[PDB]
Chain length 410, copies 4
Amino acid sequence: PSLEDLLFYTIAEGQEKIPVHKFITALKSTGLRTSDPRLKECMDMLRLTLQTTSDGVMLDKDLFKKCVQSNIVLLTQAFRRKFVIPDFMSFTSHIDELYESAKKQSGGKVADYIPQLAKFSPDLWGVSVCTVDGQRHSTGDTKVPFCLQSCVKPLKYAIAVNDLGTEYVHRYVGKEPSGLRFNKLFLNEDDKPHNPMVNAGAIVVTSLIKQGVNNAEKFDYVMQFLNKMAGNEYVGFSNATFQSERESGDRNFAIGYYLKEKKCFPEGTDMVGILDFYFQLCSIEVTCESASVMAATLANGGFCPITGERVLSPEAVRNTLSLMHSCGMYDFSGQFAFHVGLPAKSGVAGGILLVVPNVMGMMCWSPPLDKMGNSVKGIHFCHDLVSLCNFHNYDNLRHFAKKLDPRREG
Amino acid sequence: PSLEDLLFYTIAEGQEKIPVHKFITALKSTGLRTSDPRLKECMDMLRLTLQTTSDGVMLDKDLFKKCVQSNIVLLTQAFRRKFVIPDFMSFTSHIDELYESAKKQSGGKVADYSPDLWGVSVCTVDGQRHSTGDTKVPFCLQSCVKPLKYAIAVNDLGTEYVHRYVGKEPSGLRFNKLFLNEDDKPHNPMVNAGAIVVTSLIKQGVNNAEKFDYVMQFLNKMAGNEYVGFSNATFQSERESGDRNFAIGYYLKEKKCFPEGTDMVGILDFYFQLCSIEVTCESASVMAATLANGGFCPITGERVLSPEAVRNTLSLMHSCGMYDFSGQFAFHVGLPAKSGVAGGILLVVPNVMGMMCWSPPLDKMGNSVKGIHFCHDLVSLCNFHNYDNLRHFAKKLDPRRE
Amino acid sequence: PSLEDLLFYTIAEGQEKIPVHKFITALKSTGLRTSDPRLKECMDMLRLTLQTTSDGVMLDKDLFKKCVQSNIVLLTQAFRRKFVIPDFMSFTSHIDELYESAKKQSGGKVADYIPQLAKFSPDLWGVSVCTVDGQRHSTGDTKVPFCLQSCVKPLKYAIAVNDLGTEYVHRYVGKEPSGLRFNKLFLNEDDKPHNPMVNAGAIVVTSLIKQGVNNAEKFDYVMQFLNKMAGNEYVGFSNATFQSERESGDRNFAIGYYLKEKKCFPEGTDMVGILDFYFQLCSIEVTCESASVMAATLANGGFCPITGERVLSPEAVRNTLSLMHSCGMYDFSGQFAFHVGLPAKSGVAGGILLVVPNVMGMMCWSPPLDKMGNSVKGIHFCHDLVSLCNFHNYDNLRHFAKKLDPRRE
Amino acid sequence: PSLEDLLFYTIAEGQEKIPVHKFITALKSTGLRTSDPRLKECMDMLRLTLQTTSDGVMLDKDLFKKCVQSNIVLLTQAFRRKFVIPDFMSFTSHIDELYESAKKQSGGKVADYIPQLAKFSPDLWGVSVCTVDGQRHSTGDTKVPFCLQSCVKPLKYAIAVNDLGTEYVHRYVGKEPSGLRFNKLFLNEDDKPHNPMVNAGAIVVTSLIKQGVNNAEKFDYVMQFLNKMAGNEYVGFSNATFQSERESGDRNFAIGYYLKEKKCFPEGTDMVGILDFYFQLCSIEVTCESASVMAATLANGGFCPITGERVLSPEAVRNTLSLMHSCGMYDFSGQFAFHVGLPAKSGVAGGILLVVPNVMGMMCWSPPLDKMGNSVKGIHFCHDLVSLCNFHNYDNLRHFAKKLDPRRE
Ligand SMILES: O=C(Cc1ccccc1)Nc1nnc(OC2CN(c3nnc(NC(=O)Cc4ccccc4)s3)C2)s1
Ligand SMILES: O=C(Cc1ccccc1)Nc1nnc(OC2CN(c3nnc(NC(=O)Cc4ccccc4)s3)C2)s1
């Protein structure tokens, strides 16, 4: 036997040769993009042969084997329906219906407290999916950059835990939701911020990362980390959002001074500098597509699904998912945990970073926010998604009534 | 081909005939008990055969088929290693090590309002069973009954109705003192005020004796008809010592928290009865396993709770099940669990197993010292944490694998 | 000289004899009522003289001395303008204006959680004054009985402090207002109710009075005490209000069980009986007139101004006034202390028991309550009263701007 | 007759002439000091005379009249026992015993969070009295300057109410104590600081004074105001304390940014400059003697007793006294109101500014603080002071048991 040959026969369907377009089309139907970083050698060899061979455009068992040899494992998993969602085409058509249904929820108000948030249209709405196997889908405004804002909080907490361990980080920040009106206190009674997902907690976490080096390096370090989480897709920076965040951060300066007086930072912290670093981190830009890969990295135990690279330790990923479960959605976190049961994090630019553990990551984005600060369409989408699929953390994988399970076939 | 014969040959060893003891020994090794209610027909057929011919007592291909035909599917899944934990005996030896390690945590004080009793029982979603320690000693559910009666109410009345009367969130680590949240509902079903309201929703219109019978019948189904009892002694002491519960009851009454037509004073008495319901570790593990198994009881196959009832209960055990330790427990253990003052910890590993840990000595937060220690070790050892990853899990063992 | 004689000359006005009506009219103008218990011998002797002497109706120096001799000390202070408010007639005409101004404030809702409060007309409005010298004035519906309700809380706290002392009583109840939303908590962090003026605190205080004896005695004992505080004017009991208070007291039973579980009562307390005693104390009846005398006893350091009897210890009175100042007006207590600056206690029946220390006591009553549970007209009356007179706790007695001071001439 | 004449004879004792020293000793006997600003013309005349006739040094009726005539009203009133405390010498010996009793309470910890407070000896202890008539007494370390710190909060709140009125000022700050652990919150539910006596409230109040003008003038204005309040006795500034307060005021900066974001300041406020002004105000220095005069201005309805000058409106003084009663002693405020019943304000330097309305002002100073931030010796002195005298706000002026009343003879 031979695996490249075994693939060859499955796609050849009996003909002597496989047209290249027929291989490309079958590959995309699995959900992979041809630009997948794990498929580069196969795509390079295909492009090279379609130069050497303008006598084609067809691959015999020879030529096919030459192209797929270096990525044969992933291609076999792709073609033998071994991905976490085997019938990805059916699933993306469900994603699209959920998208269109959320598209009609027109309520909410865009964040307008700084000019670069009232700038974004209330009609932008995009959702991107990235499975733990790298299968991709996007519908709507998914290549429009927007700032992570508080969607960055779980990402930088994961970085802190990855670099420093659970015990160190939670010497400085708690691990629990505060309560439906302790949402207003900066500190719990151990004089720690309640958890990493609130502003006082995120400010302390920001103060833990890459200590001793300057802010430009700290930022480069977190940015390269975000690059790996996103499989090197778009991670950027909105200096416009940064200038306004630093001009409108009286509440954060109030938090910073409160934390300083209560001795909440690591020894030797320049609190005013940390606030500026914190302001920078909330102005980091993503698209729905690149952010979906970040969420998928968290869905995938800390491995980036489109590169195969280990980005975060399991401990960092587990802790981050645990705190997104209970603290990720502002005052809606309890209701969201109950009704959706998925680790998620919202931001004031309208993003919702969503993790379906072991299945996929998602970024939902629509700027108009509800009274709690969460994107109206994203929240609607996340309720619909769990209504349709047995993705709720406490759905059962065997008995799930009439929910669809996209991990199954028939 | 044929499934009974193929099963016969896998057990046959090539040999012509199967000793009956060899089949029992092979069956017990899968984790199933011979008393399993779903194997009743097969054990019935074996009992009849083990009279017919005692110069055997050997099952030829014909006679083996005679006994196993009506349970062949369940027996095949057991023998073809298809259960949720395939190498079940390896797993139970890990349970034993975990048990012995918690056995050395002697601290804590029994609720006094025995310190050397300690048992853990496992029931997987496929009905594989294991116990270590004092697992057939009855004890009262106390607050371990709160998720069970909440599931019953959601099962019979739906989420929307039940949560007109009770919230669905933890209160906060010093809002644990308030009976009502901001909408004048108790915070969640896992606190006493919430459980009192939930008690007032079950089987309205009938008297408390019927209500109790109905809850007992429901708990029987949850436990696949294993031990469910009632401790009148605990009931009397709970009711003579329930000043705080009367305080909660009167507070709820004044604040219009009960369904219209509620006799609050009677509900408190019903409530005292429910916390005095008795289980063992073994029967309670089946109850937990029903919650682990989407509401189907694993040793009978019966649909006991709606998926909605089970999901809601697991969600609220995640965040509210372990008193002031609920947040730390959700973070560090990541499993839906519920503790009780008699020393019980009802533990659910969704899609895998249910467990009851029982050890009366409680820590400062009211949770059984040994149980809490066991639950930390268990997730430290296996990738059972709610937010462990199933593919990349570092050095943890995954008992679902081979 | 002679005290009766010189007083005789002060009233005689050169005339040889004093008409009896001329003496009575001058006596009433000081603010005393002829029925004042400290004037009994003089009034009995006057009535007797108008029988023996239907050849009158005039009192010569001999006869005037015969009638006023045994109350000459009080009568001299009355007639020599020595009372705390010398020009009482002027003062009561201000009280009347204040009354009429508050009468036009028609807002508020009569308490209706029990039928005996809901029946009370929203248009009843009465204010009664009793000075620390026993001078009296009333305008409006001042002889209509109503239940003290929470106006009894400072009185029973005073009884407890009088009988048991500050230190003992405040082992069981604090001495501070709770804060603008610790009003829903039954206990402060030391597991005591915050102060005696909240329900939980009053229930605990109720549990301290005459421990060991049964409720009928306890009630008689407290009633004896209120009688003296009111100079034996009307103190009654509304059994109808008691039956309704006890059948609808879920929150008080919730408080009762919480306190028992937290061991807030003295050892040997029958908590459910204490709740029953507590409901009885809230159903005790007064009028504006009689309750004003109770307030005046508190205004007068524990002596009842119309009998001269010592009723409460100064320690009991100071403590009670201190806590009415800061905790007497429900959630309005801080605003009331700031703007009115007087020890006061409201109740759900519309009463406001009001104390101007060293000056007078008042009961204001009008059933309609505002959102905080305080009588709309009483609250309006009490603001106006301090706007007009330098009675605020922290008004100055020497420099008080445009305010009137009724203690001066 | 003649007022200078009668007075001369009362001091003359029938004798021919009054030696000047005998008049001075007699005057101090009333409690007034010879440096009293209202006695300047008389002391000027005495100084001129103590040159003319150094064959003396004695004043005949003519010469005495020459000296005392322009201060005759105050001098008679002093010499005829007409002051608020007639037997002032008796009173100061009670103060001395109270002083000596508190001197034996050596506990407490000197504030050390800035090096200017840790410099102060734990053994410094001073008490100064100034009555509403200007009678003066001091025992201990009463001319050692220390900073007001939070004792300034009532003074600047009084200024703000005096300049802007009650209604405007309390658009920005509440009028109530918060509760014993809403003490960690910066704002009440109306997004106002709870009261002017907490840091958040004092910071907002600072932002109201002389708006629109820069900080240097604002500070000058407050210093002139404090000068009037102290009858021009010692008011200074500790720049060292100011520098330390401002580099270590993280919680105050946290409060400032919180108030700014919640829009708690008047339109056009530079919050960071207000914090700087606020730190300056807490570094203003007094002695026990001068601060006692400021307290006496508050005891005297806004008139400074040693100058006769109107300094604050009665409204400003009433409000400040009201909020010192309930909010002036940090977490001890409720206990202090209950047990001492006097408006007071403590500060971290160990000062307690104490007001007995209509009677006297006091400054107590001893750096060692208790766990709540109040001076251990000051707190002890203030309890003893009211255990001894019927100065409690709700003591009765007529029936006060065995307490001493220094207003009586
Ligand atoms: O005092 C202590 C100890 C302590 C006291 C003070 C400081 C620290 C510690 N522990 C006590 N625990 N219970 C008490 O008596 C109650 C049973 N009570 C309920 N009252 N109100 C409820 N529901 C709402 O108010 C709605 C709501 C409004 C705002 C926020 C949240 C909810 S539930 C009060 S005292
Ligand atoms: O000290 C601790 C430790 C502790 C935690 C839990 C229990 C006990 C002890 N925790 C913190 N304490 N202060 C903090 O920084 C703040 C500046 N803050 C303000 N937040 N909110 C304000 N104003 C209103 O909310 C309106 C309002 C609404 C309802 C009631 C009262 C007021 S002012 C918080 S964190």
